[PDB]
Design a protein around this ligand. Structure first.
Ligand SMILES: C[C@H](CCC(=O)NCCC[N+](C)(C)C[C@H](O)CS(=O)(=O)O)[C@H]1CC[C@H]2[C@@H]3[C@H](O)C[C@@H]4C[C@H](O)CC[C@]4(C)[C@H]3C[C@H](O)[C@]12C
Ligand code: 118
Ligand SMILES: [Mg+2]
Ligand SMILES: [Mg+2]
Ligand SMILES: [Zn+2]
Ligand SMILES: [Zn+2]
Lengths: 49, 1336, 49, 79, 48, 49
DNA sequence: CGCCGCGTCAGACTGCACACAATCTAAACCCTCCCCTTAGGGGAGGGTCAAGGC
RNA sequence: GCAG
DNA sequence: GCCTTGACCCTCCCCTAAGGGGAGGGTTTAGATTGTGTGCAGTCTGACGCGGCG
């Protein structure tokens, strides 16, 4: 997978409500991954590695 | 030798008693002279001598003085194999928690001290204190103190109280507890509160405390003060060839434990500051935790590879542990392997074994015969003789393989016909020559397949290979009963070509004296093999006594059917060959020979069929050319018309009249119609394209096309592949499943162009990857099924039970998917089945329904037979042979001692690689029947049902049911109850997009608290012209009538309460929101018209059926039979009540309101009625509808998956797995017994306990049987060896250890692990002798 | 590979289920005879004896 | 010789019991001087044992009473 | 055939003697397993 | 030198060459691999990749 | 008491071939104990060889 | 890396 | 034939005089330095259970 920012989803495969949950993911060539995502309550969260 | 296996915790004195000395140094060996160092991990003095009968310094060297301990260095003089047996021990400077009893959830040290795992971990990692006893102070026992709280409460309370930290503290707590006082206090605190999950936590802890009291285990032994050291020959430090060494990772882990232990002893002798000794105690705790189970607490210790170290727990756990890599299957001597190749000259019972493999697999046998016959003076001379391959060892070798069978095995051994014994025939090649008929059983093709040869050594193994496993004993499949040694591709094409008929074939119409004259004509060239002739055939019928009687008649046959008659055994009709024999006709011919004449003539018959099919397939020269794929000339016209139609739909879409959605849908459907028109034109042009002459006049016949003969014989391929050869290859699907809107209009006889080929690969790689990743999904299901059923053996002959399941033909809507005969062939009846004319017993009570009895049942019209099943069998620990029924592979009742659990699990799991990943129209005549009949007559004279579990069956004129549908509640039925109809007669009408409120009785409309504005929105539309109402939903109304729900009542024109028939309670319609009310208050409604309208697989399916996985949206069921009522709605989770007639009424629910409830208020329900709808959960089916109900549900829902894919598995095999799932019970009322309430016991245990209680008059326990999926039922066996070798070894072993379990080795995995005979089969007699000589 | 003369026909069971029935002239003519070269090493080491 | 054991299973109505009886008999004739009760047509002792089962010359009861008889006759060699 | 260390040599010399009879013991890998569970501080035994 | 030595000798992508015929060589060189260090694992690689 | 987060637990079977891991640091004192240096001596432990008598 |  | 009997004879272990050579173990080192860093992996999904937590 190329380095860059990749926007993806899980297509309602969580919380049984069929709610599509989005997440960006910054993937570098070397270094720490940085993800942003949505929870089922529509709150933007962030993960590092 | 030993009758059981006992596991338990290890006392430190017990550990010091295993050991032969303390390991004081990490020294493994010396580096210059590699002798083992003193007091090291490899010590000759502790663990015994490194050479056989030899002291380490060499002062004592021979077995003259054996067992003496050399006083110079204390190594004994004995065999060196004692280094595999003698353990040592490390005396830990500080205690150390055993990680298995600290971390394996639920934590036993946490469960015992009633202390959460985070507080325990904070105590032992030297972060917090804990007051091991308070005394006369305000500090209770388990109260943890942080540093400063302890620091001050020191000088407030002096040294009265005692608090500690570290595993010394946890050991002081575990030693300082009194178990019986705690368990009795837990019992009195149990009998006080009725909180369900708190009572369950208390019962968990009670069972743990009493398991510590029963067993000899002391709690404080969960904290290591002595460590055992594995014997050194099991963690070897061995010299490799290159002068380098190779070691086990346990030497690293033990070495680290010893280092940190010795440094801890030095820090204690130096009186280091306490930061340093605490750090060293944390590090010793870490090192012991890494030795026992690496990587469980935190981070794995990697050594010298950045690859984790393999700890003691990883040696015994997983796909690479001892249990699965070395105990349940192992590498085997006297075994070879080679490529398989055909050899079709063979008989059914023989394989071809190369001489070069047989000389090596049979080497001791040849040495024996070489010395016995005097050809070698010495076994060394014999070794040299077989090395030189002298000409006499080939005669000896022909002598020693003579009647000696070998086992041939092809992996994956999906089912028991994957290992079969054949007599060897020595051949010259290097490839095993496998007789063709057995290949279908092995799943073997000769494209590179290799098979493994094994040699039965003893006489018992030779007789089991002869008598149980020889391939002439396995001609029937253990799954369905159908023949598994059955002709295939070349044989069936030869026999189909032989038994066909051409119209004007050479030598037609002549009259023949018999099959021999037909063979003479055909070999002379004077008659074609397809010449329709008149031949005198003598055939024998089996008389009623059993003997054969002849009959002789000129039959109208062809020459080839006459030739084929010469190989047919005697007791068979001539009509069995007087037809064109495809694959199914030959399989039925073999089955007929088996059922009429038995095994011995069938084997000869099958070999004769193979030889004659091979021969006459060769004679035909049936070849595939490119002209055999005849493409219809109407293909280009069909495709051009379809392209015209799709272009019309496209330019209509430019006209906007259609959405892209229906444009796409219509383009797909008008290409699918083109694909079927092309396939019909192709097949019609292909299948009769022979038009030939009789007496000049042309006449069409079935085609002699090679492609069509191969498809039509069942030899290879189907019409679905001839479609892609000669028709078009149709619409493809994208990788995400959505099908591409333009098809591959081309076929493989033409070219696929580059784009169509790319589109083709889209789905071809999906199929190949599915195949690659579903074998691991099916093999794991098979493993789980074998491990849930491994210990089921037929142990009795008759349990004397009278129950059983009611077998009926399965009818899904309007067609039988499985007739009664296929479901009761071979089972044993449980009650007298009698004719539809009653009291005439057709079949007696305990008969095996073999084919004669099923033919008798089909002469009559019996539609249901109550038949013995294994879920209904009274035998505890096993099943009786009558409840099981027929042995599918022999065709008689099953012998006592058969391991039917492994057969059932292999029969279910072997086909697993073939699986993946409105109104009612009567079809044909019959009397209409309804069940759950509650009917009224509507305004128009129809019938309308007042029920929700009513279903519409169709009784035939003979008495049997031929279709059955399920009608929604209040469907209007155009045809009444008990009337005759014909094909297409639509009976029941409704609309699925809404649900009506059915009028109870005829009367006038009134509003019971249906307030204008509070419970409705008044609406006005112009299409019908009338005003109407909508009942208000939750979030759109006021306070008030959202709480008090709207109702409508029946009042006549006089103002009187009109009633329902039979009951004079007020009859109401309690309407929920989202309802459409288009009737007015005071309108006359006859009973039956609408008052309001409210709008609305594969291998994982089998896996989560047998795993009893609860569906995501479970259909709610009615627990107790009563009347529905409602509690606090609009909460987010409503509350429902059911009111019985003569029972305790209040029974609550937490039904979430976001799912439509499918019953109404006034009516009654019963146990099992679906309140809501959805996929049913098997636990609910078991609790509410019974045991036989969940049995019927599981077998129907698994056979639904296996019947799409055309797989024929019997239902015994699913009923066996269901019986092994219904193996536990939960005590609800303890009775006069020793079982506690609410604790889960083995079902046979509580059954024999009740039996001995009621034998002495006392009252027995009452139980609720439970449904555990195959994994949770495999891990809940009464044997920790079975459950520990299945999976989750750590949980099974810690639970069994603290409970002090005892494995009596009753199943088959425990007897395979210890190297004993299995208690099933030929080892069943020995185990019965063992249990009749030790119990007495 | 080599340009072999094939006939597509079932022959007496000997090409059942993907087997191939080769003539003897394919062996006389050394058509599919292939040379294979193995290297075998004998290592004289220094041992402690 | 032997290609199918089905006739011998009708005398000993089981396959597992047949295996055990024929193994006991085959060990009698193999390590033991006990000669066959049928003509030994170049057969191994497993197959001769089966060919004796098939003619009713051997079953568990027959082998048991022979064990009793010859055991009495050779332990009563009290001199 | 596999693990019995004393049973495999008895089986060999029995085959060479013309006596196709086994004297099976305990598989050695079961003994390895018992010693690898007893080194975990768990007393696993064989009850006579 | 040890970094490049372990890469060229011990990496998953540094493979023993197929040398059956010329086609095996020239198609082993034109080979793309989703696996390797920094890529997928053949067990955890899904259906969609 | 119902829910969300977190941890744990699984994930086909035989076969060939190949082949591990690769970085990573003190010196100057002293001591004891063992084996070695010549050209054979000394002796315990254990066989062997012609002779003789029974 | 591959074979079924 | 059955014995003895003195004379030989072999191997092997240790010893010589005055240290040499090495192995394998101890011990102190006095300007002053006072918190680990891989340019890591993190990338597997689904089921289940249990525990904080509102
Ligand atoms: C016994 C075994 C045959 C199977 C032979 C064949 C291949 C040999 C290994 C490789 O050579 C790599 C490596 C070389 C090192 O020098 C010593 C270790 C290694 C692991 C060897 C060990 C052993 O010698 C192997 C396993
Ligand atoms: C470790 C071990 C096996 C698998 Sb997979 C799998 C997983 C995700 C997506 C596709 C495949 C597997 C197989 C059966 C049941 C459950 C998981 C797998 C197994 C064998 C070969 C290739 C992939 C995954 C991790
Ligand atoms: Mg194959
Ligand atoms: Mg590989
Ligand atoms: Zn010694
Ligand atoms: Zn029964």
């Amino acid at each position: 997978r190329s380095p860059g920012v990749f926007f993806d989803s899980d297509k309602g495969k969580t919380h049984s409500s069929g709610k599509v949950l989005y997440n960006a993911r910054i993937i570098p060539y070397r270094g720490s991954w940085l993800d942003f995502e949505f929870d089922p309550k529509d709150n933007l969260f962030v993960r590092i590695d | 030798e030993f009758d059981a296996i006992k596991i338990a915790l290890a006392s430190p004195d017990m550990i010091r008693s295993w050991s032969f000395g303390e390991v004081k140094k990490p020294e493994t060996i010396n580096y210059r002279t590699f002798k083992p160092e003193r007091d090291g991990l490899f010590c000759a003095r502790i663990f015994g001598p490194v050479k056989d009968y030899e002291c380490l310094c060499g002062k004592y060297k021979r077995l003259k003085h054996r067992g003496v301990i050399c006083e110079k260095c204390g190594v004994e003089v004995t065999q060196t194999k004692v280094r595999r047996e003698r353990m040592g021990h490390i005396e830990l400077a500080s205690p150390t928690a055993h990680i298995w009893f600290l971390k394996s959830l639920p934590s036993r040290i946490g469960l015992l001290l009633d202390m959460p795992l985070r507080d325990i971990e904070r105590v032992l990692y030297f972060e917090s204190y804990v007051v091991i006893e308070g005394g006369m102070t305000n500090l209770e026992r388990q109260q943890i103190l942080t540093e400063e709280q302890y620091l001050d409460a020191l000088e407030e309370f002096g040294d009265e109280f005692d608090a500690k930290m570290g595993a010394e503290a946890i050991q002081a707590l575990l030693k300082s507890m009194d178990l019986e006082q705690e368990c009795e206090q837990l019992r009195e605190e149990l009998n006080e509160t009725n909180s369900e999950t708190k009572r369950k936590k208390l019962t968990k802890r009670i069972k743990l405390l009493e398991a510590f009291v029963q067993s000899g285990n002391k709690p404080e032994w969960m904290i290591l003060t002595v460590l055992p050291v594995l014997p050194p020959d099991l963690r070897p430090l061995v010299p490799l060839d290159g002068g380098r060494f190779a070691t086990s990772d346990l030497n690293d882990l033990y070495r680290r434990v010893i280092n940190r232990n010795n440094r801890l002893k030095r820090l204690l002798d130096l009186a280091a500051p306490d930061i340093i000794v605490r750090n060293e105690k944390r590090m010793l705790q870490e090192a012991v935790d890494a030795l026992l189970d690496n990587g469980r607490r935190g981070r794995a210790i990697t050594g010298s590879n950045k690859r984790p170290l393999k700890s003691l727990a990883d040696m015994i756990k997983g796909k690479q542990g001892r249990f699965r890599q070395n105990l349940l299957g192992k590498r085997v001597d006297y075994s070879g392997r080679s490529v398989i190749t055909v050899g079709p000259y063979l008989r059914l019972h023989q394989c071809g074994l190369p001489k070069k493999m047989a000389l090596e697999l049979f080497k001791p046998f040849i040495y024996g015969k070489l010395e016995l016959r005097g050809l070698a003076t010495t076994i060394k001379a014999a070794k040299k003789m077989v090395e030189r391959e002298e000409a006499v060892v080939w005669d000896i070798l022909d002598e020693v393989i003579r009647e000696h069978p070998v086992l041939l095995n092809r992996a994956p051994t999906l089912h028991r016909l994957g290992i079969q014994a054949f007599e060897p025939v020595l051949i010259e090649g290097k490839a095993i020559q496998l007789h063709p008929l057995v290949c279908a059983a092995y799943n073997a093709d000769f494209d590179g397949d290799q098979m493994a040869v094994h040699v039965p050594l003893t006489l018992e193994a030779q007789l089991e290979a002869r008598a149980l496993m020889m391939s002439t004993n396995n001609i029937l499949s253990p799954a369905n009963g159908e023949p598994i040694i059955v002709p295939s591709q070349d044989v069936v094409l030869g026999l189909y070509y032989m038994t066909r008929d051409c119209v004007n074939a050479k030598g037609e119409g002549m009259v023949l004296t018999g099959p021999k004259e037909a063979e003479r004509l055909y070999r002379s060239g004077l008659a074609s093999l397809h010449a329709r002739v008149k031949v005198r055939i003598t055939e024998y019928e089996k008389d009623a006594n059993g003997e054969l009687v002849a009959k002789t008649s000129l039959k109208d046959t062809t020459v080839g059917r006459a030739i084929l008659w010469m190989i047919v055994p005697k007791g068979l009709p001539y009509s069995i060959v007087n037809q064109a024999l495809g694959k199914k006709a030959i399989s039925k011919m073999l089955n007929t020979c088996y059922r009429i004449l038995g095994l011995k003539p069938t084997v000869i018959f099958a070999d004769q069929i193979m030889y004659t099919g091979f021969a006459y397939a060769a004679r035909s020269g049936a070849s595939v050319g490119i002209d055999d794929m005849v493409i219809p000339e109407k293909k280009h016209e069909i495709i051009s018309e379809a392209e015209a139609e799709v272009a019309e739909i496209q330019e209509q879409f430019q006209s906007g009249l259609v959405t892209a959605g229906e444009r796409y849908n219509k383009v797909i459907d008008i290409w699918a119609a083109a694909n079927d028109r092309v396939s019909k034109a192709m097949m019609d042009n292909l299948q009769t394209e022979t038009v030939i002459n009789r007496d000049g006049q042309e006449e069409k016949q079935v085609s002699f096309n090679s492609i069509y003969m191969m498809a039509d014989s069942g030899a290879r391929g189907s019409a679905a592949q001839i479609r892609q050869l000669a028709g078009m290859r149709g619409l493809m699907a994208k990788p995400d499943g959505s099908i591409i809107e333009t098809p591959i209009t081309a076929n493989f006889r033409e070219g696929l162009n580059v784009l169509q080929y790319f589109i083709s690969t889209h789905g071809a790689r999906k199929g190949l990857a599915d195949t690659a990743l579903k074998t691991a999904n099916s093999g794991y299901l098979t493993r789980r099924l074998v491990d849930v059923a491994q210990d089921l053996v037929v142990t009795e002959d008759d349990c004397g039970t009278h129950e059983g399941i009611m077998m009926t033909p399965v009818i899904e809507g309007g067609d039988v998917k499985e007739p009664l005969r296929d479901r009761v062939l071979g089972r044993v009846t449980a009650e007298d089945v009698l004719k539809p004319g009653t009291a005439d017993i057709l079949v007696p009570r305990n008969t095996l329904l073999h084919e004669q009895w099923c033919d008798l049942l089909e002469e009559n019209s019996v539609d249901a037979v109550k038949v013995r099943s294994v879920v209904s069998c009274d035998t505890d620990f096993g099943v009786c042979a009558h409840c099981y029924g027929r042995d599918l592979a022999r065709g008689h009742i099953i012998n006592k001692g058969e391991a039917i659990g492994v057969i059932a699990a292999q029969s279910i799991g072997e086909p697993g690689t073939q699986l993946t990943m409105s109104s009612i129209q009567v079809k044909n005549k019959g009397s209409i029947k309804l069940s759950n009949v509650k009917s009224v007559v509507n305004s128009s004279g129809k019938l309308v049902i007042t029920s929700r579990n009513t279903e519409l069956k169709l009784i035939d004129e003979f008495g049997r049911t031929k279709e059955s549908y399920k009608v929604p509640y209040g469907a209007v039925l155009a045809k009444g109850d008990g009337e005759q109809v014909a094909g297409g007669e639509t009976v029941a009408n409704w609309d699925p997009h809404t649900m009506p409120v059915i009028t109870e009785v005829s009367g006038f409309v009134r509003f019971t608290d249906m307030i204008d504005g509070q419970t409705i929105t008044r609406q006005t539309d112009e299409l019908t012209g009338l005003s109407s109402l909508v009942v208000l939903d939750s979030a759109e109304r006021t306070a008030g009538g959202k709480d008090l729900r709207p109702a409508l009542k029946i009042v006549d024109a006089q103002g009187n309460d009109v009633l329902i028939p039979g009951t004079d309670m007020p009859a109401q319609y309690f309407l929920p929101g989202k309802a459409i009310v288009q009737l007015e208050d005071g309108v006359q409604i006859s009973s039956g018209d609408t008052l309001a309208r409210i709008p609305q697989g594969g291998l994982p399916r089998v896996a989560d059926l047998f795993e009893a996985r609860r569906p995501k949206e479970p259909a709610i069921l009615a627990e107790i039979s009563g009347i529905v009522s409602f509690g606090k709605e609009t909460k987010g989770k409503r509350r429902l009540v059911i009111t019985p007639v003569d029972g305790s009424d209040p029974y609550e629910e937490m039904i979430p309101k976001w799912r439509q409830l499918n019953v109404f208020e006034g009516e009654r329900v019963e146990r099992g009625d679906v309140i809501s709808d959805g996929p049913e959960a098997p636990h609910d089916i078991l609790r509410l509808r019974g045991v036989h109900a969940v049995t019927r549900y599981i077998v129907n829902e698994v056979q639904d998956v296996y019947r799409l894919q055309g797989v024929k598995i019997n239902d015994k095999h699913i009923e066996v797995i269901v019986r092994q799932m219904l193996r536990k019970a939960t005590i609800v009322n303890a009775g006069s017994s020793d079982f506690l309430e609410g604790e889960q016991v083995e079902y046979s245990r509580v059954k024999i306990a009740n039996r001995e209680l009621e034998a002495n008059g006392k009252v027995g326990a009452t139980y609720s049987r439970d449904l555990l999926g195959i994994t949770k039922a495999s891990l809940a066996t009464e044997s920790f060896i079975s459950a520990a070798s299945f999976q989750e070894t750590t949980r099974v072993l810690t639970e069994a250890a603290v409970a002090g379990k005892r494995d009596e080795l009753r199943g088959l995995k425990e007897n395979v692990i210890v190297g004993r005979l299995i208690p099933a089969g030929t080892g069943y007699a020995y185990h019965q002798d063992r249990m009749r000589r030790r119990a007495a | 590979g080599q340009n072999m003369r094939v006939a597509f026909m079932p022959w007496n069971g000997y090409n059942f289920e993907d087997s191939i029935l080769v003539s003897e002239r394919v062996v006389q003519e050394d058509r599919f005879t292939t040379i294979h070269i193995q290297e075998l090493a004998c290592v004289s080491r220094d041992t402690k004896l | 010789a032997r290609v199918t054991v089905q006739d011998a299973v009708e005398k000993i109505g089981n396959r597992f019991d047949l295996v055990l009886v024929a193994a006991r008999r085959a060990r009698q004739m193999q390590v033991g001087g006990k000669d066959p009760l049928v003509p030994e047509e170049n057969d191994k002792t497993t197959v001769i044992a089966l060919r004796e089962i098939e003619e009713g010359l051997i079953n568990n009861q027959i082998l048991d009473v022979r064990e009793r008889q010859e055991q009495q006759e050779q332990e009563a060699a009290e001199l | 055939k596999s693990d019995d260390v004393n049973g495999r040599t008895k089986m060999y010399k029995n085959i060479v003697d013309g006596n196709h009879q086994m004297e099976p013991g305990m598989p050695e890998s079961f003994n390895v397993l018992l010693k690898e569970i007893r080194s975990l501080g768990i007393n696993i035994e064989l009850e006579d | 030198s040890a970094a490049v030595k372990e890469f060229f000798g011990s990496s998953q992508l540094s493979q023993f060459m197929d040398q059956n015929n010329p086609l095996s060589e020239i198609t082993h060189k034109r080979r793309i691999s989703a696996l390797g260090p920094g890529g997928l694992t053949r067990e955890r690689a899904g259906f969609e990749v």
